[PDB]
Scaffold this active site. Structure first.
Site, short mmCIF file in Angstrom:
data_model
loop_
_atom_site.label_atom_id
_atom_site.label_comp_id
_atom_site.label_asym_id
_atom_site.label_seq_id
_atom_site.Cartn_x
_atom_site.Cartn_y
_atom_site.Cartn_z
N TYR A 76 38.93 47.69 31.31
CA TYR A 76 39.69 46.38 31.27
C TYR A 76 38.81 45.30 31.85
O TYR A 76 37.99 45.27 32.56
CB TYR A 76 40.85 46.49 32.31
CG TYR A 76 42.14 46.63 31.85
CD1 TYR A 76 42.25 48.14 31.40
CD2 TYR A 76 43.37 45.93 32.07
CE1 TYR A 76 43.43 48.57 30.75
CE2 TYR A 76 44.46 46.66 31.66
CZ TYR A 76 44.69 47.91 31.05
OH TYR A 76 45.87 48.12 30.56
N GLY A 117 46.44 40.43 33.97
CA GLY A 117 45.49 40.24 32.69
C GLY A 117 46.03 41.33 31.66
O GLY A 117 45.45 41.55 30.81
N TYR A 119 48.19 42.16 28.23
CA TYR A 119 48.70 41.60 26.95
C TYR A 119 49.99 40.92 27.17
O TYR A 119 50.10 39.73 26.59
CB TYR A 119 48.69 42.45 25.84
CG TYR A 119 47.23 42.88 25.41
CD1 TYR A 119 46.09 42.00 25.09
CD2 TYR A 119 47.31 44.34 24.90
CE1 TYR A 119 45.06 42.59 24.57
CE2 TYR A 119 46.08 44.95 24.47
CZ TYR A 119 44.85 44.15 24.29
OH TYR A 119 43.79 44.61 23.91
N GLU A 173 38.97 46.82 23.44
CA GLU A 173 39.57 47.89 22.37
C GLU A 173 38.66 48.23 21.28
O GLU A 173 38.84 49.30 20.83
CB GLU A 173 40.72 46.88 21.58
CG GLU A 173 41.80 46.26 22.53
CD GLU A 173 42.76 47.31 23.38
OE1 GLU A 173 42.41 48.63 23.24
OE2 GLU A 173 43.77 46.96 24.05
N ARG A 176 37.20 51.24 22.83
CA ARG A 176 38.09 52.17 23.02
C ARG A 176 38.34 52.90 21.51
O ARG A 176 38.49 53.98 21.65
CB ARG A 176 39.44 51.66 23.61
CG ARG A 176 39.56 51.06 24.96
CD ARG A 176 40.71 50.75 25.00
NE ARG A 176 40.84 50.10 26.64
CZ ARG A 176 41.18 49.10 26.94
NH1 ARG A 176 41.51 48.08 26.23
NH2 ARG A 176 41.13 48.52 28.23
N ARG A 193 38.04 35.20 9.65
CA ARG A 193 39.02 35.52 10.62
C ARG A 193 40.30 36.00 10.15
O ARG A 193 41.16 35.50 9.42
CB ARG A 193 39.16 34.32 11.81
CG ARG A 193 39.81 32.97 11.08
CD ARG A 193 39.99 31.98 12.20
NE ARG A 193 38.55 31.51 12.51
CZ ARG A 193 38.25 30.73 13.37
NH1 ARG A 193 39.22 30.47 14.28
NH2 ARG A 193 37.27 30.19 14.10
#
Ligand SMILES: Nc1nc(=O)c2ncc(C(=O)NCc3cnn[nH]3)nc2[nH]1
Length: 261
Positions: A76, A117, A119, A173, A176, A193
């Site tokens: 995190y 923090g 989401y 992420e 992960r 993007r």
């Protein structure tokens, strides 16, 4: 003192971003703990403070930089530094509160935000959900600037939260999940993007339950199947660790592994 990985949006190619993610995984996990070929992050219990964090120094084409602190126990983002100020998310407990004192220790101006923090919180503050926040090298370049100008009042709180949401997904992420890493590489390759589709959002949401299901599994087999989504939002049941080997790169430590049998 804590390891630093550098990444810049200025150069950015799929190669440099891959090198970046791979080096973050490398500092997050030790190789001590791998189950069904997936690395497990260090156990927070008894983890000495000198081993607790990593740092990710982000630079951008606008020549600014910012340093994020990642907790190695869960990957995190716990806080960040820009020049002379640091900010940390509101800690979950007293032990984390103490642990964060060991970061950015010579900074003049240290602040703890009154909000956490996760989401859900960041998304309220941003006034936008992950599904409506575009990701890519351009979002990241701009997140870097936004975080860098917060202390001078230049960046509005919703843009601050939006900017963390960008950094968390593109960094933690992606570390992960190989899958999320590959989604980012696509964005960088075509220099376009775009917001994360349900396949990304559901993986992010499921990381902790997937970690538990894998570590509780009987020889790989889930006691209870876990529902993910494909890109079009349809169901995909996960019954076994095997189907996740190309998708999940790191798990949060839940329990000691059973004796191999
Ligand atoms: N700063 C920060 N860094 C992260 O790497 C991160 N990763 C996941 C979530 C999240 O809310 N995930 C789902 C969740 C559900 N319950 N707790 N978390 N938040 C995070 N925030």
């Amino acid at each position: 003192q804590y390891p630093i990985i550098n990444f810049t949006t200025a150069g950015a190619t799929v190669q440099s971003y891959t090198n970046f993610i791979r080096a973050v995984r490398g500092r997050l996990t030790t190789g001590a703990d791998v189950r069904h070929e997936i690395p497990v992050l260090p156990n927070r219990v008894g983890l000495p403070i000198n081993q607790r964090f990593i740092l990710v120094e982000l630079s951008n084409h606008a020549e600014l930089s910012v340093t994020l602190a990642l907790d190695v126990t869960n990957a995190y983002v716990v806080g960040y530094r820009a020049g002379n100020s640091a900010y940390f998310f509101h800690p979950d407990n007293q032990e984390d509160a103490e642990a964060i004192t060991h970061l950015f220790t010579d900074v003049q101006n240290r602040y703890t935000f009154a909000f956490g923090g996760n989401y859900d919180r960041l998304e309220q503050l941003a006034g936008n959900l992950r599904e409506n926040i575009e990701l890519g090298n351009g979002p990241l370049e701009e997140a870097i600037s936004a975080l860098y100008y917060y202390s001078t009042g230049g960046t509005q709180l919703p843009t601050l939260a939006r900017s963390f949401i960008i950094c968390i997904q593109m960094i933690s992420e992606a570390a992960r999940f190989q899958y999320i890493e590959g989604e980012m590489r696509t964005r960088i390759r075509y220099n376009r993007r775009s917001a994360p589709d349900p396949s990304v959002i559901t993986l992010e949401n499921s990381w902790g339950r997937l970690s538990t299901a894998i570590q509780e599994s009987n020889q790989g087999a889930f006691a209870s199947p876990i529902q993910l989504q494909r890109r079009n939002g349809s169901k995909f049941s996960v019954y076994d660790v095997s189907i996740l080997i190309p998708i999940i790169a790191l798990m949060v430590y839940r329990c000691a592994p059973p004796p191999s049998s």
